[PDB]
Amino acid sequence: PFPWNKIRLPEYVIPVHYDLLIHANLTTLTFWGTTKVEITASQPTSTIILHSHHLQISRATLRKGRLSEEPLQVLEHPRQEQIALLAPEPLLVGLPYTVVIHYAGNLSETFHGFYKSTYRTKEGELRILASTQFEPTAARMAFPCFDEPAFKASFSIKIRREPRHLAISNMPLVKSVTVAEGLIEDHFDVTVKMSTYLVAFIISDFESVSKITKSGVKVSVYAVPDKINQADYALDAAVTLLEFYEDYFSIPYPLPKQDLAAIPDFQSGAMENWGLTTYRESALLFDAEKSSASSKLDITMTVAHELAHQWFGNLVTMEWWNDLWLNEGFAKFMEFVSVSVTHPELKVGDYFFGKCFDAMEVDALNSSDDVSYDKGACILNMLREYLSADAFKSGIVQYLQKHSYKNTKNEDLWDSMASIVDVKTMMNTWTLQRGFPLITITVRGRNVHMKQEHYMKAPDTGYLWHVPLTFITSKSDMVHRFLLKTKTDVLILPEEVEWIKFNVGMNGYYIVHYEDDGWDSLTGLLKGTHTAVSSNDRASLINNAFQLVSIGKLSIEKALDLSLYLKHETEIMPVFQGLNELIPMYKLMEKRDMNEVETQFKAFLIRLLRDLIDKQTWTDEGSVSERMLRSELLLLACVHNYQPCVQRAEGYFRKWKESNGNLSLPVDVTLAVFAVGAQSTEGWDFLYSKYQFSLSSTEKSQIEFALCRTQNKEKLQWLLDESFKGDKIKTQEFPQILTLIGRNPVGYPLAWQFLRKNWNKLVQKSSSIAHMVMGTTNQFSTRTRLEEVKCVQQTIETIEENIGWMDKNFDKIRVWLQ
Ligand SMILES: *[C@@H]1O[C@H](CO)[C@@H](O[C@@H]2O[C@H](CO)[C@@H](O[C@@H]3O[C@H](CO[C@H]4O[C@H](CO)[C@@H](O)[C@H](O)[C@@H]4O)[C@@H](O)[C@H](O[C@H]4O[C@H](CO)[C@@H](O)[C@H](O)[C@@H]4O)[C@@H]3O)[C@H](O)[C@H]2NC(C)=O)[C@H](O)[C@H]1NC(C)=O
Ligand SMILES: CC(C)C[C@H](NC(=O)[C@@H](O)[C@H](N)Cc1ccccc1)C(=O)O
Ligand SMILES: *C1O[C@H](CO)[C@@H](O)[C@H](O)[C@H]1NC(C)=O
Ligand SMILES: *[C@@H]1O[C@H](CO)[C@@H](O)[C@H](O)[C@H]1NC(C)=O
Ligand SMILES: [Zn+2]
């Protein structure tokens, strides 16, 4: 008869200090433990409820003292993942007791809790390690505890191990003691007050490289012995970032050391474990044969994210999981603030707003986690730019200092910052409400009118925000603020302006629309002097215009006249906005009869980017986003028979066919070159042969693309059947080829006519196949093309939209083009 019926633990029995002894066998894959918890009762009681999961409790007793011990009855409630310890007599309030529990268990084979993980040496031998992953609720798998983040305590952790291994944990190793023949007991120092999910220990045979920060904090990277030489980058990144955070938060790194460990088969793939963060090997290790340029960038931000938690989230952790979004939101946001300073060469800035746009697009739906954590960061950025960067900085410092080693709620962050503007009430409009507002700007003389409304793709919501508006003016030279608390508000300028732009820097989590013809002046501004506003300002314009176009508040030509400025753009962010909203348009024309508009449109696009495309070096140099633009520009140009790039491309492909595939080819350009090369029936075949010795590389996927891009319909249809056969390739690729051909202007009918025919035997191999049903019909725009198609319930909608868009815009695009 279990004495507790709540998922949450009783609040009247409180842990103070854990003494953990874990003895794990990395051969038999089992572990025994003796954990002792010092507790205090605030109310009299003879039952102690706590957390346990998949642990066989051998023995539990209660100690007090001058010493006295007594057995505890043990009841399990596996559903709730809880135990109950029954005492003979009630506990004396305020008096310190100690619970001693003996238990045993099998190392997790599920990559959570205290789990087994493996790797193979270059010699090919298989090694075992034991590792931890507790967030959110897995500590109870390694040892019994009060497994809620509010129950903080100190931890004395002891690991028994073989001499061929080494244990690392949260705190530094104090002493190693030979305990028996093949047994050593590692004692690590007592932790500071922390939550269970942040406790961690690793048993393995890793190497390490170590550097010492300016403040004397020892930073080390542990990795598999064969790969330890790839930690040099992460280690340096860790050191400089730790130093950054110590300055920013104006609070010294709380712990004696910081250990970053690269874990085989890690599935998180990063964790904020206090003093011992863990990562997937690709997020920490770097080879001169890198997975990509993105990896360096990838690992420089994954680190920065986990290191930021050392302060925000560990030193001051949430009270409960409902605030996890703030923990994660802040770490994401901090990825940028830190790196932008620390590693400017990486150009992290671009990728931030991308995720903000991504978040918004999803919030704009009827329905409304990593993206929710992206909104958190976006929100924070908004707030940080409203209040000065320093007001923000100090407010955070105060938050950390006031709540160090304790727990927190959302309001606590707001309260702390609001004490340096009713931040709390404002922020809750953004936190307790799904979606974001569309903001319409109406000007009447010096009278500037603002209005807000819940922006969503029937339309009837009463949502209302406290929005931190910002704006610049053809006259002003400085950025203005205005707090929009109501449905509408006015604002009076000292004099009439030639143009006004809101959401400066694109730092705010909202889209703005200009009434009358503010767009006219803005697109007039961009075509005259586009540098008059920031790069991101230009990007937000392009982005908002084409969104407003898709909801019927802006006319397609107004947003196209806008893009005309792009002929002069040099910055990545805007160009990608342009491309992201323009391309899809002709991909709907491609799957339609009318070829004249399709061709004039493509002609228009290449005349816009002409200059930019020419400036492209045909190398692999530059930052991740610089390389992504080079890659996409060239591919585009050659796909649209822009002669200059097509010619060059042909040349390169010839030098590489007669190579044969021997001389190296820059990955940025290979996508275009292969594409061009696959156009000849002999080049297509060469690629297909070279397609096997592709080395399971990135190169394979590049060819796979080029092959599907040929205009030879027989060679396309051919790829279709063969990737369905067992002999040449089967399940691992067909789904992706089908969609790739479904996007070829001359190959879409085949993939459609194929999904229909072979449908029966096709379904024969239903959650990952939805990709194939979208990628085959996603871009139809005809009413009749619908009569045909009549899980993938979404694909039916998206076409409906494609048609509306066409019935409205096609006639405007046609006239525009002339
Ligand atoms: C996880 O669990 C394993 C068992 O599953 C523990 O492994 C045992 O560890 C002990 C201590 O390291 C090993 O003991 C050694 O046995 C030797 C004789 O071999 C016996 O066992 C082997 C292997 O099965 C048989 O082939 C052989 O026929 C025998 O039956 C002894 O010679 C060793 O002597 C040691 O003790 C003497 C006396 O004090 C000393 O003088 C020696 O110098 C030396 O210290 C030793 O007793 C035992 O063999 C291991 N098992 C196996 C199967 O090999 C792991 O220790 C444990 N590890 C962890 C990290 O938890
Ligand atoms: C966004 C990245 C830079 C960092 C990210 N990692 C994190 O956010 C970590 O701090 C998280 N601790 C990862 C996590 C969250 C929830 C449950 C288990 C593990 C990751 O992708 O691994
Ligand atoms: C051809 O080039 C490859 C490197 O791409 C090289 O490893 C190989 O040895 C070369 N073949 C020669 C030089 O005969
Ligand atoms: C570990 O698993 C085995 C079965 O593979 C089981 O018999 C054994 O009792 C388990 N050990 C525990 C639950 O402590
Ligand atoms: Zn995190």
Q: Can you give the three-state secondary structure of 320-389, one letter per residue?
A: CHHHHHHHHHHHHHHHHHHHHHHCHHHCCHHHHHHHHHHHHHHHCCCCCCHHHHHHHHHHHHHHHHHCCH
Q: How far apart are CA 364 and CA 399, in angstroms?
A: 32
Q: How far apart are CA 509 and CA 547, in angstroms?
A: 14
Total Cβ atoms within 10 A of residue 595: 11
Evaluate whether 741 touches 747 at the Cβ level (below 8 Å).
Answer: yes
Q: For residue 361, which of 535, 547, 504, 540 has the smallest C-alpha distance?
A: 547
Q: How far apart are CA 113 and CA 132, in angstroms?
A: 5
681-686 contacts, C-beta under 8 A, 24 or more apart: 681/712, 681/715, 683/653, 683/657, 684/710, 684/712, 684/715, 686/657, 686/660
* Cα dihedral 196→199→204→207 (10° resolution): 160
272 is in an annotated binding site: yes
Q: In what order do the strands lie in the sheet with 488-492?
A: 488-492, 447-454, 437-444, 511-514
Strands 73-77 and 82-86: antiparallel
Annotation says 335 is catalytic? no
Q: How far apart are CA 672 and CA 702, in angstroms?
A: 9
Q: What angle do CA 449, 450, 456 make, to 5 degrees?
A: 140
Q: Is residue 180 lining ligand 1, measured as CB closer than 6 Å?
A: no
Evaluate whether 158 touches 168 at the Cβ level (below 8 Å).
Answer: no
Residue holding tokens 């009569």?
Answer: 787
Q: How far is the CA of 656 from the centre of ligand 3 (A)?
A: 13
Q: How far apart are CA 371 and CA 356, in angstroms?
A: 9
Residue with the smallest CA separation from ligand 1 atom 31 is 181
Indicate which residue of 148, 246, 281, 306 is catalytic: 306
Q: How far apart are CA 262 and CA 618, in angstroms?
A: 35
Residue-range domains of the chain with CATH: 1-206 (2.60.40.1730), 207-435 (1.10.390.10), 436-514 (2.60.40.1910), 515-818 (1.25.50.20)
- Which ligand is closest in space to the CA of residue 328? 5
607, exposed or middle or buried, with CB in 10 Å at 0-12, 13-18, 19+?
Answer: exposed
* List of residues 6+ apart from 28 with CB closer than 8 A: none
Q: Is residue 304 lining ligand 2, measured as CB closer than 6 Å?
A: no
Q: How far is the CA of 717 from the centre of ligand 5 (A)?
A: 46
As a whole number of angstroms, the longest Cα–Cα distance in the chain is 98
Evaluate whether 586 touches 636 at the Cβ level (below 8 Å).
Answer: no
Cα-based distances in Å from 53 to 163, 412, 642 = 30, 33, 63
Q: How far apart are CA 313 and CA 155, in angstroms?
A: 18
Q: How far is the CA of 306 from the centre of ligand 2 (A)?
A: 8
745, exposed or middle or buried, with CB in 10 Å at 0-12, 13-18, 19+?
Answer: middle
In a 3-state reduction of DSSP, which class is residue 507? Answer: coil
Q: How far apart are CA 762 and CA 230, in angstroms?
A: 44
Q: How far apart are CA 805 and CA 73, in angstroms?
A: 70
Q: For residue 496, which of 443, 432, 570 has the smallest C-alpha distance?
A: 443
328 is in an annotated binding site: yes
Evaluate whether 621 touches 642 at the Cβ level (below 8 Å).
Answer: no
Helices 423-431 and 410-417: angle between axes, nearest 10 degrees = 140
Query: What does the DSSP assignment read for 94-107?
Result: T-EEEEEEEEEEE-
Query: What does the DSSP assignment read for 275-331?
Result: TEEEEEGGGT---TT-S-HHHHHHHHHHHHHHHHTTTBTTTEEESSGGGHHHHHHHH
Beta pairing partners, 482 = 469
Q: Which amino acid would we find at residue 438?
A: L
Q: Which atom of ligand 1 is nearest to the CA of 25?
A: 61
Residue with the smallest CA separation from ligand 4 atom 2 is 106
709, exposed or middle or buried, with CB in 10 Å at 0-12, 13-18, 19+?
Answer: buried
Q: What angle do CA 611, 616, 621 make, to 5 degrees?
A: 155
Burial letters 293-303, b for 16+ CB under 10 A, else e: bbbbbbbbbbb
187 is in an annotated binding site: no
Q: For residue 589, which of 580, 601, 579, 605 has the smallest C-alpha distance?
A: 601
Q: What angle do CA 503, 505, 506 make, to 5 degrees?
A: 55
502, exposed or middle or buried, with CB in 10 Å at 0-12, 13-18, 19+?
Answer: buried
Q: For residue 95, which of 60, 44, 49 has the smallest C-alpha distance?
A: 44
Residue with the smallest CA separation from ligand 1 atom 13 is 182
Q: Which atom of ligand 1 is nearest to the CA of 28?
A: 5
Evaluate whether 121 touches 59 at the Cβ level (below 8 Å).
Answer: no
Q: How far apart are CA 446 and CA 490, in angstroms?
A: 10
Total Cβ atoms within 10 A of residue 660: 10
Q: For residue 22, which of 11, 9, 35, 12 has the smallest C-alpha distance?
A: 35
* List of residues 6+ apart from 323 with CB closer than 8 A: 408, 409, 410
Evaluate whether 304 touches 335 at the Cβ level (below 8 Å).
Answer: yes
- For 628, the token pair is 């992504």
Q: Is residue 479 lining ligand 4, measured as CB closer than 6 Å?
A: no
Evaluate whether 537 touches 504 at the Cβ level (below 8 Å).
Answer: yes
Residue with the smallest CA separation from ligand 3 atom 6 is 662
Q: How far is the CA of 630 from the centre of ligand 4 (A)?
A: 56
